[PDB]
Amino acid sequence: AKPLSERFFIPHEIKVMGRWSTEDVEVRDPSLKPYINLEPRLLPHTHGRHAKKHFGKANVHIVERLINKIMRSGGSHYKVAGHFMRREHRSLNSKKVKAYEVVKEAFKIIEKRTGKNPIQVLVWAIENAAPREDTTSVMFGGIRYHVAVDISPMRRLDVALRNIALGASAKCYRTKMSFAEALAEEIILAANKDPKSYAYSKKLEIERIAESSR
Amino acid sequence: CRDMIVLPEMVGLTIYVHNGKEFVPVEIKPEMIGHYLGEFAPTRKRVQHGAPGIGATRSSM
Amino acid sequence: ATVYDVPGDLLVERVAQRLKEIPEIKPPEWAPFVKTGRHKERLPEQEDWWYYRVASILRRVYLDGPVGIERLRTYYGGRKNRGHAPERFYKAGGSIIRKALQQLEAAGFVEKVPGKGRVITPKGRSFLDKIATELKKELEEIIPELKKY
Amino acid sequence: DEGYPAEVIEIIGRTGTTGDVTQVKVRILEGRDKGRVIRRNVRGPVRVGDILILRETEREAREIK
Amino acid sequence: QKARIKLASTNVRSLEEVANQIKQIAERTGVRMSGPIPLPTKRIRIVTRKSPDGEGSATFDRWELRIHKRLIDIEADERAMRQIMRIRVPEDVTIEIELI
Amino acid sequence: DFRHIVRVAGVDLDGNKQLRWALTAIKGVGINFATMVCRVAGLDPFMKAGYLTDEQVKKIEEILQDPVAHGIPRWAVNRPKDYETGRDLHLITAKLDMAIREDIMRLRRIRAYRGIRHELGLPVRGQRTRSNFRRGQTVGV
Amino acid sequence: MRIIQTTGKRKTAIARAVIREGKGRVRINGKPVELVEPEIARFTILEPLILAGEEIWNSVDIDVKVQGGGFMGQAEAARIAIARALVEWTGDMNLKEKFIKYDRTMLVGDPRRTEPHKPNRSTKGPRAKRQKSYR
RNA sequence: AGUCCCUCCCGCUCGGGAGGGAGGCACUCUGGGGGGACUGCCGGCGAUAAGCCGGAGGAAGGGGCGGGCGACGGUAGGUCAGUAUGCCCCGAAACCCCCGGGCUACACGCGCGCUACAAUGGGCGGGACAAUGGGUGCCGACCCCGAAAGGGGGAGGUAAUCCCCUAAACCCGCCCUCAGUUCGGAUCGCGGGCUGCAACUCGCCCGCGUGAAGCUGGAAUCCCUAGUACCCGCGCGUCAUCAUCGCGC
Ligand SMILES: [Mg+2]
Ligand SMILES: [Mg+2]
Ligand SMILES: [Mg+2]
Ligand SMILES: [Mg+2]
Ligand SMILES: [Mg+2]
Ligand SMILES: [Mg+2]
Ligand SMILES: [Mg+2]
Ligand SMILES: [Mg+2]
């Protein structure tokens, strides 16, 4: 199936997974600019040394952040698209090899379908899927109310990544589509502001609810 | 001896096997070859349930 | 070039293809009806699994000799699904391994060290190394970094 | 339609029902009222030097102790 | 023509004393002695439930016993062999001598 | 050539399935026994069932009649050491059902423990019955 | 005839590396490094060599013996040993400075180990506990 | 690991490997002793005190990380069915033995779990990498017989020496393609075995056959802050045989 040249691939430059360069990737949003790490790096696997320190996740390559985000089950204690998705034993939790392969194949599909650098498309997707205003809850007379507040950039990035991962997880659940194809489809849809993307619709709903309660 | 194996030369007799409190009669038939005696002398009485008592459900305690 | 210089599975495939020319290697008469261990569930699907197993055993003896039946039984075991009970590890059977070793000895590739097990003869070592060299010659045309080794 | 960037210059303190909200002072970087300093409520971790994207620049948070 | 000595004790200090005495005996004579080799320590660990009854939260005790070991090799010379044969070990130290 | 339905031993078989899996529609033939009979008959187990000819179907049915006489091991049949004749037999469809029914009836006639358990619809192989095996409706206090 | 030996440790995996003048051949337990699988493990070992440069890479031979741990633990210990051997063999501080910028752990190691388990569902972990019920 | 000798392989040997013997304590390891971190240094806040916040260097930074040790008392909390013990009872039975039963019953309510409801998979062939512990009433390599479970001999080991002991999740190739199915494996039939004085009530293992509910779960509610949680197997205790458990790795 897979050619031997791909099974035994030897890199010679410091670039993401030995296949893509992030030299020409630019971040349009001024707020997310210092929180999307794009430094040159070959292997995106830091062995979880960043979670100890405050704001430590800022200097972690974005591809590894995506890999960590999809390394989960997906629907444990809340419903996504109206269903619990409890993978359990068959879940991808604690298997970083499989998540790495899924991300690699998704990037290949994205590059084939659009002809652009996959990291650029990922950056566009997270830029379009990050909300700008949220709400917090108050209690009065046994009734719950909302009050509009602003979001810090790091939380924006976290929410965007989680929503992309959840949409990809929901698309491949008990259907004929595979995980890599679902991830590529979700990223491409989110990059074009298409309402069929789970993340973009979620962002629109969040901002609408926040606006209607100023 | 509830664990005695039925043998062909035992066919035609009647044996009283202890069941815990009494000896019950067993008439040995040819199709009983190879089985233990205790298989034909039940030790427990069949259950017929009555009305559930106090504490049988959460609301009845 | 030696056995250490090539991936294991490709070498096993090539050796299995080559072993069909040796008259002393023949599947036993009960081969088409058995599983390869109590932890499996269905019969082997390849019509020539015997040669694959024999080639694997030969390469195993090359690398870890001397070795006996029990340790090979450990090697070919695996995890078993037990219905409602949790999965567990189990060993494999003995007849397949013993017959394969006896046939290999009859072919002159292995010999018996008393009280220790079975080891690879010079003939078998040459037989394996020649195929390994051929495979490496084929392989380095597409991976230029292998020319150094 | 795209909001206005603002820069955080001071941290005041935590607030909210469960201590989830922080009150900060920000300076507008772009738009009609560029250069003005107003206080705002923010959800999520934040530090001096961050940049927020406000959707409107006329609402000011009530001062907390 | 060599003797092998095995020592074992639950008290480290007594073991050191006996080893030092043997080393000094070997030093006071012209005889080569392979140094005291420390072998792995034996740990005996036993875990037991605390309460006599079964009521209450379950808590456990972890009791441990440690046994230390040493190994010494020395060449059989009667002038030094008698000296080590007459040394008196404490009651909590076990000594065994064999000729190889 | 290709036929979308093939009938073997009174059972209609799918023609789009592999032969080894197509043969499992017969009650009394699992995946392993089907593979054994395919190998004995000298047929590729992975061939489509729709390419069979009449002679091959006849051969398969003949093998199914007396598998032991055609080289299948005696420990692979589903009724070895028959209670009446003492031979090793393989049964399918109705004959299998009536053989099982006859076994249970024989157990019931002699009033054996397993016979009573079969009559009352209770577990036979020594399971506990206080917690599980519940099939009914809740009774109120 | 220079020979240099270095050591690397990572969560019960121990690697010993020997470096000398050569042609660029690197072997892990006798296997060429270009055949290590899976890919994520192969790239872990190759990073110090790629950082050093091709001229240095083709001028030395390295042989590594590693034991203990798992397939991912063994790769990292080999990586540490190779990095230390490289910085010692060439003995230039520009390369040592470059390694610290890219990954500090290449030279200082990783001291993390497993935490011993405790009662109340001991087999699962030191902190995971049995589900609690009240009625 | 370097150095020497012998034997065997490959591209025929410039070069590259594997065993064995000499030889060595370099490296790993084992275990005795010692060093190392003290808010010690730098900048702020506080009072100039007690301290707090942030940096350098460092293997380690602010109880460095994980454990043991639980004050005066209370809870008429649990235990006289581990042992010790007052009073009251039985004292030819409520004491001491033997045989057979029961604690394993089954319209039903509840606690903690295991296996699943499939592709973030099922099957078949092939390829990789551990640690803690235990062994003479015992662990048993190695050879032979058997399809499997198992059977007949039997080296070494009172153990850093011999054995349990070549883990699984993971990777490569082929079949299946969203279906109550090549998902799930409850229930039942026939046959073969081991332990034991005894396997029916009431044990565990293997082969062929059969093929239940289940297609993600209402109101509610539990655990967890880093080598932690999730996922994956292994060791010991109990033990003649029997682990969906406890304690550990
Ligand atoms: Mg395997
Ligand atoms: Mg499973
Ligand atoms: Mg752990
Ligand atoms: Mg009381
Ligand atoms: Mg009970
Ligand atoms: Mg299945
Ligand atoms: Mg029984
Ligand atoms: Mg379904």
**What residue segments make up the domains of chain C, in order of their start?**
1-149
Q: Tell if the CB–CB gap between C43 and F40 is shorter than 8 Å.
A: no
Strand, coil or helix: C80? strand
Query: D64: closest CA among D9, D15, D11, D4?
Result: D15
Do residues G15 and G45 lie in contact, with contact meaning Cβ atoms separated by under 8 Å? no
Both tokens assigned to G132: 């609690």
Interface list for G 101-130 with E (CB within 8 A): 119-120
DSSP class of C1: -
Nearest nucleotide by C1' from F73 CA?
H147
How far is residue G120's CA from residue C22's CA, in Å, rounded to a whole number? 61
Q: Which ligand is nearest to the CA of F130?
A: 5
**CA dist., res. G10 & res. F5, Å (int):** 62
Contact C33 F76 (CB under 8 A): yes
Whether residues F110 and B53 touch (CB distance < 8 A) is answered with no
Vertex E88: Cα angle to E83 and E91 (nearest 5): 155
Tell me, in angstroms, the distance from the centre of ligand 1 to residue C60's CA. 13
> What's the rounded Cα separation, in Å, for the pair G38 and F121?
55
Q: Which 22-41 residues of chain C approach strand H with CB closer than 7 Å?
A: 30, 34-36, 38, 40-41
The residue assigned the tokens 């006849």 is F58
Task: State which residue of chain C sits closest to A5, comparing Cα positions.
Answer: C142
CA–centroid distance, A178 to ligand 2, in Å, is: 20
Q: Is F106 within 8 Å of B31 (Cβ atoms)?
A: yes
Which amino acid type is present at position A27? V
DSSP symbol at E3: E
> Quick check: A4 and C139 CB within 8 A?
yes
- Tell me the residues surrounding ligand 3 (ion) with CB < 5 Å: G 114
Chain D contact partners (≥3 CB pairs within 8 A): A
For F76 and H207, how far is CA from C1' in angstroms? 7
| Residues G44, F109: Cα–Cα separation, whole Å | 73
Closest CA to C63 of C139, C15, C2, C137: C2
* Nearest Cα to Cα of residue F135 among F122, F124, F116, F117: F122
- CA-CA distances (angstroms) from residue G123 to C135, G116, G120? 47, 10, 9
- Neighboring chain C residues of F39 at a CB cutoff of 8 Å: 32-33
3-state secondary structure of E43: strand
- Say which residues have a Cβ less than 8 Å from residue C105's Cβ, sequence separation at least 6: C111, C112, C118
Nucleotides of H under 7 A from a protein CB: 1-3, 8-11, 16-18, 26-33, 59-60, 65-67, 69, 77-79, 82-83, 100-131, 133-134, 140-150, 155, 160, 164-178, 182, 184-192, 198-204, 206-211, 215-218, 221-235, 244-249
8 Å CB contact of G43 and A10: no
What's the number of CA atoms in the CB half-sphere (13 Å) around residue C79?
A: 5
Determined by cryo-EM
Would the CA dihedral through G64, G66, G70, G74 be positive or negative? negative
Q: Which residues, listed in sequence order, are joined to residue G111 by a DSSP beta bridge?
A: none
Selection from A151, A152, A158, A160 nearest residue A130 by Cα? A160
User: What architecture does CATH give domain F5-70?
Assistant: Orthogonal Bundle (1.10)
Cα–Cα dist C100/C149, whole Å: 33
Angle of CA points B37, B38, B40, to nearest 5°: 80
CA distance to partner chain C, nearest, from residue G74 (Å) = 19
Question: Is E68's CB less than 7 Å from nucleic acid strand H?
Answer: yes
Integer CA distances (angstroms), F62 to A211, F37, F51, F56, F74, in order: 79, 11, 19, 10, 17
**Cβ–Cβ < 8 Å for A163, A203:** yes
How is residue E77 written in tokens? 């010379």
- Pairing relation of β-strands D4-15 and D21-28? antiparallel
Assign domain A4-212 one CATH number from 3.40.1030.10, 1.10.455.10, 3.30.110.30, 3.30.70.980.
1.10.455.10
Instruction: Decide: CB of E58 under 7 A of nucleic strand H.
Output: yes
Report in angstroms the alpha-carbon separations of E47 from A195, D4, E55, E59, E66: 61, 66, 19, 10, 15
Smallest Cα distance from G12 to chain E, Å: 18
Q: How far apart are CA F55 and CA C69, in angstroms?
A: 45
The per-residue DSSP string of F39-98 comes to HHTT--TTSBGGG--HHHHHHHHHHHH-SGGGT--TTSSSB-S-TTT-S-B---HHHHHH
Q: Which residues, 6+ apart, have CB-to-CB distance to G82 below 8 Å?
A: G6, G8, G17, G26, G45, G48, G49, G62, G64
- In total, chain B counts a number of residues equal to 61
Q: How far is CA D4 from CA A211, B9, D28, in A?
A: 16, 105, 7
Q: How many CB atoms lie under 10 A from the CB of residue C89?
A: 10
Strand partners, E46: E63
Interacting residues of D40 by C-beta distance below 8 A, sequence separation 6+: A150, D6, D23, D24, D25, D26, D52, D54, D60, D61
Q: How far is CA A78 from CA A73, A166, A173, in A?
A: 12, 11, 15
Category of D16 on φ-ψ map: left (φ > 0), alpha (ψ -120 to 50) or beta = left
What gap in Å lies between CA C89 and CA C82, rounded to an integer?
11
Question: What ranges in G15-70 are assigned the alpha helix state H?
Answer: 39-52, 54-57
Say how far apart CA B24 and CA B55 lie, in whole Å: 38
Domain residue ranges in chain A:
4-212
What are the extents of the domains in chain E?
Answer: 1-100
Question: How many C-beta atoms surround the C-beta of residue A24 within 10 A?
Answer: 8
In this complex, the answer to whether residue B46 has its CB under 7 A from any atom of chain H, a nucleic strand, is yes
Residues from chain F that touch C33, judged by Cβ atoms under 8 A, are: 36, 39, 72-73, 76
Closest CA to D26 of D11, D6, D3, D56: D6
Give all strands of the β-sheet with E33-49 in edge-to-edge order: E33-49, E60-75, E2-9, E93-99
A139 in contact with D, Cβ within 8 Å: yes
Q: What is the CA E60 to chain-centroid distance, rounded?
A: 31
Sign of the alpha-carbon torsion through B30, B36, B38, B44: negative
**Residue E72 main-chain phi, psi, to 5 deg:** -135, 135
Give residue B23's identity as a one-letter amino acid code: F
d(CA F57, CA G75): 58
* Tokens representing residue E52 in the block: 């006599």
Rounded to whole angstroms, the Cα distance separating F39 from C43 reads 12
Question: Minimal Cα distance from C139: which residue of A?
Answer: A4
Sign (positive or negative) of CA dihedral C118, C120, C124, C127: positive
Q: Which residues neighbour C142 within 8 Å (Cβ) at sequence distance 6 or greater?
A: A4, A5
DSSP state letters, chain A: ---HHHHS----S-SBTTTB--SS-----TTTGGGSB----S----TT-STTSTTGGGGSBHHHHHHHHTSS-SEEEEEETTEEE--GGGS-TT-HHHHHHHHHHHHHHHHHHH-S-HHHHHHHHHHHT--SEEEEEEEETTEEEEEEEEE-HHHHHHHHHHHHHHHHHHHTTTSSS-HHHHHHHHHHHHHTT-TTSHHHHHHHHHHHHHHTT-
**What's the burial of C56, exposed, middle or buried (CB within 10 Å: 0-12/13-18/19+)?**
buried
- Provide Rg for chain E, Cα atoms: 20
Residue A86 CA from chain centroid, whole number: 20
Do E42 and E69 meet the contact criterion of CB atoms below 8 Å apart? yes
> For D45, which of A29, A133, A152 is closest by C-beta distance?
A152
Distance CA F6, CA F8 (A): 7
Q: Could you tell me how far CA A205 lies from the centroid of its own chain?
A: 18
Nucleotide lying nearest to C95, CA to C1' measure: H146
Q: Of B7, D62, G39, C73, nearest to A149 (Cα)? A: D62
> Do β-strands D37-43 and A143-151 pair in parallel, antiparallel, or remain unpaired?
parallel
Instruction: Provide residues 80-99 of C with CB closer than 7 Å to any strand H atom.
Output: 81, 83-89, 91-96, 98
Residue whose C-alpha is closest to residue C6's, from C110, C148, C123, C146: C146
Put simply, whether F30 touches C (Cβ < 8 Å) is no
The contacts of residue E26 (CB under 8 Å, 6+ apart) are E33, E74, E80
Burial of C90 (0-12, 13-18, 19+ CB in 10 A): middle
What CA–CA distance (Å, rounded) separates F122 from F116? 9
Spatial distance between the Cα atoms of E70 and E85, rounded to a whole number of angstroms: 18
